[PDB]
Amino acid sequence: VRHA
Amino acid sequence: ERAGPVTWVMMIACVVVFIAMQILGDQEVMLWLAWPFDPTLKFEFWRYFTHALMHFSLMHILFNLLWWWYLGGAVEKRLGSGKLIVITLISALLSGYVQQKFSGPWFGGLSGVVYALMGYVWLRGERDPQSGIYLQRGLIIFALIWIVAGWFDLFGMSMANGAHIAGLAVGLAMAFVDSL
């Protein structure tokens, strides 16, 4: 998962 | 003084979602709130925005909410609730769009919105001091360091780089528009  | 209603409700919403993520698990919450990940979900309109409400680590939520509280609160106080709402909806939507295009739908966080607010408050102060809103020097430095860290992946977490830059872009673009 990519973190904004 | 203290955080206005928009500032406050976003913080509350983020905390509620974060608690749900600990209780139910990140995956279960993503199923409900993530950017549409199947053509069946394309009409679930909330998904184009609610990715901004999910956080995956303590560091991530704390720093995003810190920046939101300060810059969001400032925008809301000086320029009104409506302005903060519009910045938020535009930055969430565009940052999400760019991120999914580059890396797919599994992302979340308020940082697209935060980067928009950084660019907005800085550029608005720069081009339109009259506005009353600006990003003071120390904070310019700390925003820059924060940006750089994401860009060169200095938090040992996988970063949503599209969300981050689209965010910043949106903020700068809206400041430019408002400063005319």
- Mapped onto helix, strand or coil, the DSSP state of residue A2 is strand
Cβ-Cβ contacts under 8 Å for B62 (sequence gap 6 or more): none
Type of residue found at B22:
Q
Question: B73, B72, B152: which is closest to B115 by C-alpha?
Answer: B72
Give dist(CA B21, CA B159) in Å, integer. Answer: 19
Catalytic residues of B: 111, 164
Which tokens go with B37?
């990940």
Q: State this model's resolution in angstroms.
A: 2.0
Residues in chain A that come right before a backbone break, where C and next N are over 2.5 Å apart: none
Whether the CB-CB separation of B88 and B138 falls below 8 Å is answered with no
Residue B19 CB partners (closer than 8 Å, separation 6+): none
List CB contacts (< 8 A) between A4 and chain B: 51-52, 64, 95, 99, 107-112, 160, 163-164, 167
| Domains contained in chain B, number | 1
What chain A residue is nearest to B34 in terms of C-alpha separation? Answer: A1
Identify whether the C-beta of residue B97 lies closer than 8 Å to the C-beta of residue B139: no
**From the CA atom positions of chain A, what is the Rg in Å?**
4
Task: Map residue B107 onto helix, strand or coil.
Answer: strand
In the DSSP assignment, the letter for residue B28 is H
Dist. CA B180–CA B178, nearest whole Å: 5
C-alpha to C-alpha distances, B34 to B82, B128, B158, B162, nearest whole angstrom: 25, 37, 17, 16
Where residue B9 sits, what CATH number does that domain have? 1.20.1540.10
Give chain B's length: 180
**If you search the block for the tokens 């409400």, which residue do you land on?**
B53
The whole domain housing B1 covers 1-180
B20, B29 contact by CB (below 8 A): yes
Ranges of H-type helices in chain B = 5-24, 26-33, 47-50, 58-67, 73-79, 81-103, 111-127, 137-151, 161-179
What is the C-alpha separation between B164 and B111, in angstroms, rounded?
A: 6
Contact status of B102 with chain A (Cβ, < 8 Å): no
Report the alpha-carbon distance of residue B175 to residue B180 in Å, rounded. 9
